Design a protein around this ligand. Structure first.
Ligand code: ADP
Ligand code: ADP
Ligand code: SF4
Ligand code: SF4
Ligand code: MG
Ligand code: MG
Lengths: 272, 272
C-alpha cells in the first residue's frame, strides 16, 4: 500500500515549503516518498534536490521527441533522504491550459511504473487558485485520496480552502478523494490558530498542524534546503516533524461541508 | 474614445480593493466608468454597489434560459458615482474551465452595446494566477489595451507579474495589449517601493503608484464601501486619488521584457 496525498492551497501560501519540509521529515523517519510537482511554477522539488528547480516532464518530452522516448530513470531525481522528485510543467502563459502538464505527468508516472510497492507516500503539490483542468485531475481522477489544504487567517486563503472543498464534494460519488485536514501556515497574527480550527470544524475536518512563521525557512531556502536538512535542531524543524507525525497518524478523511461567504465573514469578524 | 484597462495580479494581492477605489476616485473626478469582474470570486463590484456581491452573467443567463434572454439593463448595475458594474461568474470548482464565464460576459457586453461612447474607462478585474482560458482572453482578444499589475515585495506576487508579462509578449504581434505599469500594494516592508520600482525598470515599465497598507480599507469594506466614499478625508483616499491621476495621465504602454528567476531572486536578495 501507499498513501497518495495532495497539498492544495492558494498561490504563495506555503505549499511547496510545507510539502518539502513535511516530506524531508518523513524521509528522516525512514519513509520512502515521491513528490510530484503539479504547479506551473515548477520549483516544488528544489529544496529536496538542492537545485535551482527541476526540468519538467513537458520540457523533457519536447526535447526527446515524445513522452514515450522518456525513461522514468531520466525523469525522476532523488535528493535529500532518497526522496524522489518530478515536475509536471505546463504551457507558457497565454498558451493552452495551464494545467495540461499535470495530466501528461501523472499518466506517464503511472504507465512507467513509478508507483512501486516500496513507496510509502506520494505527495502532489497542486496549484489551487482555480480547480479545473489538470489541477482538478488529482481529484476528478482519484489520484490523491488525502487532500491537505495549506491556508492562513487571510480571507483569500480561507476562500481557497472552501473552493477546493467544493471540488472534493463534486466528485464524492466516484473514487475516494477526501479532505484530510487544514494546515495553518501562520502570518504571525493572534488567534490565527483558533480561526483555522474553527474553519476546519465548520468544514467537518481538523487543523492538523499550526506551522509558525520562522525566518529560518528563508535562511534554509537561500541555500536550497529544507529546514530539516539545513538545521535539524531548529524549533521549526520540530514543527515540521510534528506535522509529519500527525499526517502519518491521521485517520479522519471526510467529504467536507463547504460554507457560505456569510459564515466565512462571520469567522473573520469573530476572531478579530 | 474610451480607455480599456485591465487589473491583473495574484489572488489576494488587492486587485478588487485597488480597482474599486481607483474607479471611485475617477468617478469623483467626473469620469464615466464601467467595472467588469473577471474573477470567479465575483466580489469585484460589491464596494461600488454597497452589496454582498453581484449576481453573475452566468447565473442570470441560466435563470433566464439563454444569454439572449438577458437585457443589458437587467445585468449592469450602477452604484457609487454612477459607476456601472457587472460580474462574469464562472463554473463551480471542479466543473469545466474556471475562466469560461469571462468569454460569455465580454461577448454579451459587446453585442448588447455596453461600450457606449460616453464611457471614459472600462476596468476588467482579472484573476492572474493562471494565464489561460477566459483569463487570457482580454489579452489574446485585444479587450484590455492597458494592463496594470498589482503586486508587492512578495516573491509570489512578483512571479505573477512576470508571468502575466510573458502572456502580453506572447500576443504582441496582434492587437495592442500593452503593460501600463505596476501598482505596489504594500505589505509594510522597508525598501518595498524601491524593489517594485526596480522590477518595473527591468520589465521596461514603471511603478505607477505605491499604495500603503492602511486599516481604513478594512473599516470601509466592513461597511461595503470604497475608502473614497467611506472617508473622503482619509490619507488613503488621497492615495487612491493619486493613483487615479497617474493612470489618467499615463502615456507609457510597452511590450514588457520578462526576466529570469535568477534576476527575480537577485532583486529580492538585493533589497533585503
Ligand atoms: N512557515 C514559514 N515561515 C517563513 N516563511 C515561509 C513559511 N512558509 C512559507 N514561507 C515562505 O513563503 C514563500 C512562499 O512559500 P511557497 O511554499 O513557495 O508557496 P506556494 O508553493 O504555496 O506558492 C516562500 O518564500 C517561503 O520561503
Ligand atoms: N492597501 C491596503 N491596505 C489594507 N488592506 C488591503 C489593502 N489592499 C487590499 N487590502 C485587503 O486585502 C484583502 C484582499 O484584497 P482584494 O482586493 O480582495 O484581493 P484580490 O481581488 O486581488 O483577490 C482584502 O481584505 C482587502 O481589504
Ligand atoms: S482556467 Fe486555465 S484553460 Fe481553463
Ligand atoms: S487551467 Fe482551468 S481549465 Fe485550463
Ligand atoms: Mg509552490
Ligand atoms: Mg478580487
Amino acid at each position: 500500500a501507499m498513501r497518495q496525498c495532495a497539498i492544495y492551497g492558494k498561490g504563495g501560501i506555503g505549499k511547496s515549503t510545507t510539502t518539502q519540509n513535511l516530506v524531508a521529515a518523513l524521509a528522516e523517519m525512514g519513509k520512502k516518498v515521491m513528490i510530484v510537482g503539479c504547479d506551473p511554477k515548477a520549483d516544488s522539488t528544489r529544496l529536496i534536490l538542492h537545485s535551482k528547480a527541476q526540468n519538467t516532464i513537458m520540457e523533457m518530452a519536447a526535447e526527446a521527441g515524445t513522452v514515450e522516448d522518456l525513461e522514468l530513470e531520466d525523469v525522476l531525481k532523488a535528493g535529500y533522504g532518497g526522496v524522489k522528485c518530478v515536475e509536471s510543467g505546463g504551457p507558457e502563459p497565454g498558451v493552452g491550459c495551464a494545467g495540461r502538464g499535470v495530466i501528461t505527468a501523472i499518466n506517464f508516472l503511472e504507465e512507467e511504473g513509478a508507483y512501486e510497492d516500496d513507496l510509502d507516500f506520494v505527495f502532489y503539490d497542486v496549484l489551487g487558485d482555480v480547480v479545473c483542468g489538470g489541477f482538478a485531475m488529482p481529484i476528478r481522477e482519484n489520484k490523491a485520496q488525502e487532500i491537505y489544504i495549506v491556508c492562513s487567517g487571510e480571507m483569500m486563503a480561507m476562500y481557497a480552502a472552501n473552493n477546493i472543498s467544493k471540488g472534493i464534494v463534486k466528485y464524492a460519488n466516484s473514487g475516494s478523494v477526501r479532505l484530510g485536514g487544514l494546515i495553518c501556515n501562520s502570518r504571525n497574527t493572534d488567534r490565527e490558530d483558533e480561526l483555522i480550527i474553527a474553519l476546519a470544524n465548520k468544514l467537518g475536518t481538523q487543523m492538523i498542524h499550526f506551522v509558525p512563521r520562522d525566518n529560518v525557512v528563508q535562511r534554509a531556502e537561500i541555500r536550497r534546503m529544507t529546514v530539516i536538512e539545513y538545521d535539524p535542531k531548529a524549533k521549526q524543524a520540530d514543527e515540521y516533524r510534528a506535522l509529519a507525525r500527525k499526517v502519518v497518524d491521521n485517520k479522519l478523511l471526510v467529504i467536507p461541508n463547504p460554507i457560505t461567504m456569510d459564515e466565512l465573514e462571520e469567522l473573520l469578524m469573530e476572531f478579530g
